[PDB]
Design a protein around this motif. Structure first.
Motif, PDB file in Angstrom:
ATOM      1  N   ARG B  85       0.838  -1.189   0.000  1.00 22.87           N
ATOM      2  CA  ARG B  85       0.000   0.000   0.000  1.00 22.87           C
ATOM      3  C   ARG B  85       0.875   1.242   0.000  1.00 22.87           C
ATOM      4  N   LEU B  86       0.925   1.919  -1.139  1.00 21.58           N
ATOM      5  CA  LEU B  86       1.638   3.180  -1.231  1.00 21.58           C
ATOM      6  C   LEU B  86       1.182   4.130  -0.136  1.00 21.58           C
ATOM      7  N   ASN B  87       2.150   4.743   0.535  1.00 17.33           N
ATOM      8  CA  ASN B  87       1.848   5.745   1.539  1.00 17.33           C
ATOM      9  C   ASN B  87       1.207   6.962   0.880  1.00 17.33           C
ATOM     10  N   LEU B  88       0.907   7.958   1.706  1.00 17.02           N
ATOM     11  CA  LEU B  88       0.140   9.105   1.239  1.00 17.02           C
ATOM     12  C   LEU B  88       0.850   9.824   0.100  1.00 17.02           C
ATOM     13  N   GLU B  89       2.117  10.181   0.305  1.00 16.39           N
ATOM     14  CA  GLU B  89       2.812  11.024  -0.662  1.00 16.39           C
ATOM     15  C   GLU B  89       2.902  10.325  -2.005  1.00 16.39           C
ATOM     16  N   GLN B  90       3.222   9.037  -1.970  1.00 16.64           N
ATOM     17  CA  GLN B  90       3.361   8.272  -3.195  1.00 16.64           C
ATOM     18  C   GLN B  90       2.045   8.236  -3.949  1.00 16.64           C
ATOM     19  N   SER B  91       0.946   7.984  -3.240  1.00 14.66           N
ATOM     20  CA  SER B  91      -0.355   7.959  -3.895  1.00 14.66           C
ATOM     21  C   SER B  91      -0.691   9.321  -4.484  1.00 14.66           C
ATOM     22  N   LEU B  92      -0.368  10.390  -3.759  1.00  9.82           N
ATOM     23  CA  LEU B  92      -0.607  11.737  -4.263  1.00  9.82           C
ATOM     24  C   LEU B  92       0.130  11.969  -5.572  1.00  9.82           C
ATOM     25  N   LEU B  93       1.433  11.714  -5.566  1.00  8.84           N
ATOM     26  CA  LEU B  93       2.210  11.892  -6.780  1.00  8.84           C
ATOM     27  C   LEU B  93       1.679  11.001  -7.884  1.00  8.84           C
ATOM     28  N   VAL B  94       1.209   9.810  -7.523  1.00  8.26           N
ATOM     29  CA  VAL B  94       0.674   8.890  -8.513  1.00  8.26           C
ATOM     30  C   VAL B  94      -0.556   9.485  -9.172  1.00  8.26           C
ATOM     31  N   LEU B 126       3.300  19.701  -5.369  1.00  9.58           N
ATOM     32  CA  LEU B 126       3.458  18.645  -4.380  1.00  9.58           C
ATOM     33  C   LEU B 126       3.747  19.223  -3.005  1.00  9.58           C
ATOM     34  N   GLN B 127       4.536  20.294  -2.939  1.00  3.13           N
ATOM     35  CA  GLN B 127       4.766  20.957  -1.664  1.00  3.13           C
ATOM     36  C   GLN B 127       3.468  21.522  -1.114  1.00  3.13           C
ATOM     37  N   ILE B 128       2.653  22.114  -1.986  1.00  4.58           N
ATOM     38  CA  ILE B 128       1.354  22.619  -1.567  1.00  4.58           C
ATOM     39  C   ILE B 128       0.545  21.502  -0.933  1.00  4.58           C
ATOM     40  N   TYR B 129       0.486  20.354  -1.601  1.00  2.00           N
ATOM     41  CA  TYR B 129      -0.355  19.270  -1.110  1.00  2.00           C
ATOM     42  C   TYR B 129       0.261  18.589   0.107  1.00  2.00           C
ATOM     43  N   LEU B 130       1.578  18.696   0.272  1.00  2.00           N
ATOM     44  CA  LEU B 130       2.267  17.904   1.285  1.00  2.00           C
ATOM     45  C   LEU B 130       2.484  18.697   2.565  1.00  2.00           C
ATOM     46  N   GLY B 131       3.236  19.787   2.475  1.00  2.00           N
ATOM     47  CA  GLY B 131       3.741  20.482   3.642  1.00  2.00           C
ATOM     48  C   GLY B 131       5.254  20.481   3.632  1.00  2.00           C
ATOM     49  N   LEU B 146      10.884  10.068  -4.031  1.00  2.00           N
ATOM     50  CA  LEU B 146       9.626   9.573  -4.570  1.00  2.00           C
ATOM     51  C   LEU B 146       9.795   9.131  -6.016  1.00  2.00           C
ATOM     52  N   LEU B 147      10.501   9.935  -6.810  1.00  2.00           N
ATOM     53  CA  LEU B 147      10.717   9.598  -8.209  1.00  2.00           C
ATOM     54  C   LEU B 147      11.498   8.305  -8.332  1.00  2.00           C
ATOM     55  N   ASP B 148      12.507   8.133  -7.487  1.00  2.00           N
ATOM     56  CA  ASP B 148      13.267   6.896  -7.480  1.00  2.00           C
ATOM     57  C   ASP B 148      12.389   5.712  -7.116  1.00  2.00           C
ATOM     58  N   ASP B 176      -6.424   0.629  -9.295  1.00  2.00           N
ATOM     59  CA  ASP B 176      -7.516   1.412  -8.718  1.00  2.00           C
ATOM     60  C   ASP B 176      -7.350   2.897  -9.019  1.00  2.00           C
ATOM     61  N   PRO B 177      -7.504   3.299 -10.281  1.00  2.00           N
ATOM     62  CA  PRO B 177      -7.437   4.733 -10.593  1.00  2.00           C
ATOM     63  C   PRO B 177      -8.504   5.541  -9.891  1.00  2.00           C
ATOM     64  N   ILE B 178      -9.680   4.958  -9.661  1.00  2.00           N
ATOM     65  CA  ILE B 178     -10.764   5.712  -9.044  1.00  2.00           C
ATOM     66  C   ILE B 178     -10.421   6.067  -7.608  1.00  2.00           C
ATOM     67  N   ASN B 179      -9.796   5.143  -6.882  1.00  2.00           N
ATOM     68  CA  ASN B 179      -9.406   5.450  -5.514  1.00  2.00           C
ATOM     69  C   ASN B 179      -8.378   6.567  -5.475  1.00  2.00           C
ATOM     70  N   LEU B 180      -7.429   6.562  -6.412  1.00  2.00           N
ATOM     71  CA  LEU B 180      -6.459   7.648  -6.485  1.00  2.00           C
ATOM     72  C   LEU B 180      -7.131   8.966  -6.848  1.00  2.00           C
ATOM     73  N   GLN B 181      -8.107   8.932  -7.753  1.00  2.00           N
ATOM     74  CA  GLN B 181      -8.827  10.153  -8.096  1.00  2.00           C
ATOM     75  C   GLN B 181      -9.602  10.678  -6.898  1.00  2.00           C
ATOM     76  N   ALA B 182     -10.208   9.777  -6.126  1.00  2.00           N
ATOM     77  CA  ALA B 182     -10.900  10.181  -4.909  1.00  2.00           C
ATOM     78  C   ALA B 182      -9.927  10.782  -3.908  1.00  2.00           C
ATOM     79  N   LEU B 183      -8.735  10.201  -3.798  1.00  2.00           N
ATOM     80  CA  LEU B 183      -7.720  10.768  -2.922  1.00  2.00           C
ATOM     81  C   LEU B 183      -7.313  12.159  -3.392  1.00  2.00           C
ATOM     82  N   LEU B 184      -7.174  12.344  -4.705  1.00  2.00           N
ATOM     83  CA  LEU B 184      -6.868  13.666  -5.241  1.00  2.00           C
ATOM     84  C   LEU B 184      -7.979  14.654  -4.928  1.00  2.00           C
ATOM     85  N   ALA B 185      -9.228  14.210  -5.050  1.00  2.00           N
ATOM     86  CA  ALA B 185     -10.348  15.062  -4.683  1.00  2.00           C
ATOM     87  C   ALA B 185     -10.259  15.451  -3.217  1.00  2.00           C
TER      88      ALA B 185
END
Lengths: 50, 195, 50, 195
Positions: B85-94, B126-131, B146-148, B176-185
């Motif tokens: 399970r990709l952590n938060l940041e990875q899923s965000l970038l994804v 990404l900084q905006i979304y992350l902190g 993250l890129l690596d 699960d693209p929909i779950n990632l889109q929901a996370l982006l939302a």
């Protein structure tokens, strides 16, 4: 520092925040393990565990 | 008794397994070998409960579980595949890279023009979304980590001299693209309400 | 001395020398200083622990 | 449309791959499954350039890189195997373990793996070679780090409540007289080069 203070910060943020503030703070020492804490105490009271 | 599977075939197969993928434009010979020998490839996967999906235009092959969904389990479990399970940041970038790949496919077509971008623009979003972790250089460090990790997960190429990257087609095939889109939302929602 | 007690006490004496100034004023963590010093001295065969 | 390899065979083989080895003493079902369809496993591994070795006295099965054409440099070059090659000090510990293993195997016969050791006994033996940093805790950290690394190669269970571990029988095949002699010759070679 008080139990309420620490609980407040704990809800504010994780133990990361706790120890960051402790860095920022004075007259305080966290101990993410009990043995170290107990050593600190026995130090501050000139008494062995017995 | 049994004669050896063609060295070319086993070679291409081991490539595909190591990277779970094969790209023609980068390694055309293995891609073609598998193309000429898909029945044998899948037969090889057949005992292991594996299989390959294909995308000729994006020029990719990828492994995949042969089993059906929930035949005897609530959730499918494959021993040789750990469902990390990709952590938060990875899923965000994804999610960002998913929508960016979509947008690039609109701007250049699907597959024939691989998605590309300069890393600079990504750092602010990404900084905006992350902190902030403490500095802009720390933003660069975390982003490059993250890129690596993506690249290790077959999801991006390295940032070159200009820190330009190629987004791997497997993102298009992700589960699960929909779950990632929901996370982006959720992310944009949180950013909007917190101001 | 039990190791933890030893290191805590060491950190305490090291504070007596952050109040000193002529050798390695700790201003980040005296306990960390005590840890590192114990590591070194063990490394110098000075102190062995069973 | 296409036939399915015995689902039970697929299960046993994929599990045995996950573990790299399979013991009668633990999962006699899959172990006997392989025993019934060893050639099936062999065929399966041939695309993979792998093989099954067998030791039924010890109730053990274990995969092994096909030797036919795997790069002459080392079987470890194999793309799909992931864990890193064994190293010197690790092999030192391996030797110590194998010694204990064989000793107890005599004392109890060559049956199942009741080959138990107490960690404290290793500390003296290993102390002679790696030395003595003069802090029992430091040496235990060292020793457990090593043991861990070994369990990464599957040779040893991690310490239990009683700080005892059992030697995985796979060691003996990793430590058959042939490997011992080859490595020993290489060690003498290294002594010569150093001298």
């Amino acid at each position: 520092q008080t139990l309420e203070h620490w609980l407040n910060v704990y809800h504010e943020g994780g133990t990361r925040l706790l120890r960051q503030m402790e860095k920022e703070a004075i007259g305080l020492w966290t101990y993410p393990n009990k043995k170290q804490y107990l050593a600190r105490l026995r130090d501050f009271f000139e008494v062995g565990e017995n | 008794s049994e004669t050896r599977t063609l060295q070319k075939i086993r070679e291409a197969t081991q490539e595909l397994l190591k990277y779970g993928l094969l790209e023609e434009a980068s390694k055309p010979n293995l891609y073609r070998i598998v193309l000429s020998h898909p029945e044998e490839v899948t037969r090889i996967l057949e005992p292991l409960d594996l299989d390959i999906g294909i995308d000729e235009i994006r020029g990719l092959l990828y492994v995949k579980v042969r089993l059906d969904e929930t035949p005897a389990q609530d959730e499918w479990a494959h021993p040789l595949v750990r469902r990390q399970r990709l952590n938060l940041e990875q899923s965000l970038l994804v999610a960002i890279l998913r929508q960016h790949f979509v947008a690039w496919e609109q701007e250049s077509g699907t597959g024939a023009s691989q998605a590309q971008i300069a890393i600079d623009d990504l750092l602010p979003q990404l900084q905006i979304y992350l902190g902030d972790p403490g500095s802009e250089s720390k933003e660069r460090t975390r982003l490059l980590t993250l890129l690596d990790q993506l690249k290790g997960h077959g999801l991006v190429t390295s940032p070159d001299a200009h820190e330009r990257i190629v987004i791997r087609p497997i993102i298009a095939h992700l589960a699960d693209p929909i779950n990632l889109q929901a996370l982006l939302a959720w992310l944009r929602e949180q950013i909007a309400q917190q101001t | 001395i039990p190791l933890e007690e030893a290191i805590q006490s060491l950190s305490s004496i090291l504070i007596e020398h952050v109040s000193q100034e002529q050798y390695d004023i700790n201003q980040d963590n005296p306990f960390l200083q005590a840890s590192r010093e114990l590591r070194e001295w063990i490394k110098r065969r000075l102190i062995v622990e069973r």
